[PDB]
């Protein structure tokens, strides 16, 4: 069947928004008076770096970004020319709540206001090309419960998107300060294992769903359920 073209070197840019220090949030926003620094997030940034460099992307890391700073960054890559690129990736590592992610200042950036900056109209050099977003953040403060089981041509403006959420809405996602987050670490492991095999991203994200689903938070009897969304029209593979 149809497969997105993926032969350019580099494949495209891989943005990494890596939020660790939330002192501004603790100071300015009363609601987030005790929101914690995201210790161990560099383990995700590093794993993402290693993984997508192996997949021939050019990594563009940005540390400790407020909401306005994130917007500025996205607007820059929105206005850039991706004509010689076959793909675009944006990884966000931060705190969040339902439908949003927090900047280090504790302000809110709705996820749709992030992804929509790279629609075909707003970023024509990425038209027809896969745009992939990975969001590592909570989407609420609820613990996901567990359940027992037995062991020319015109296309839509919002085409070719892939949104990989670390969790379903309303619920938390986990970060091990000594290992990284459940979602990102699992994602990078699956990518590095299955991309050389030629597996597509939906298959890999399915495996990620399976892997994270088997992890437990024994302190609160919590689980985590990642949730991909996509408008992809072709199979997405990352040759190596």
């Amino acid at each position: 069947d149809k497969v997105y073209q993926m032969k350019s070197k580099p494949r495209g840019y891989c943005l990494i928004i890596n939020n660790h220090n939330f002192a501004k949030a603790r100071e300015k926003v009363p609601k987030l008076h005790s929101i914690r620094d995201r210790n161990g997030t560099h383990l995700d940034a590093g794993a993402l770096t290693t993984t997508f460099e192996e997949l021939h992307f050019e990594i563009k890391p940005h540390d400790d970004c407020t909401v306005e700073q994130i917007y500025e960054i996205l607007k820059i890559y929105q206005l850039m020319d991706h004509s010689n690129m076959d793909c675009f990736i944006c990884c966000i590592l931060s705190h969040g709540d339902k439908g949003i992610i927090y900047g280090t200042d504790g302000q809110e950036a709705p996820i749709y206001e992030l992804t929509s900056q790279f629609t075909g109209l707003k970023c024509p050099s990425l038209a027809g090309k896969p745009k992939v977003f990975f969001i590592q953040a909570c989407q609420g403060d609820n613990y996901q419960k567990g359940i027992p089981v037995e062991t020319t041509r015109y296309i839509p403006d919002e085409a070719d998107f892939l949104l990989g959420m670390a969790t379903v809405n309303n619920c938390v996602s986990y970060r091990n300060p000594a290992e990284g987050t459940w979602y990102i670490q699992s994602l990078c492991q699956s990518l590095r294992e299955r991309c050389p095999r030629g597996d597509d991203i939906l298959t890999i994200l399915t495996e990620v769903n399976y892997e994270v689903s088997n992890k437990d938070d024994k302190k609160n009897m919590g689980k985590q359920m990642p949730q991909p969304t996509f408008t992809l029209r072709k199979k997405l593979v990352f040759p190596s």
Partner: peptide, 4 residues
């Protein structure tokens, strides 16, 4: 374990 911590949450985001």
């Amino acid at each position: 374990l911590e949450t985001x």
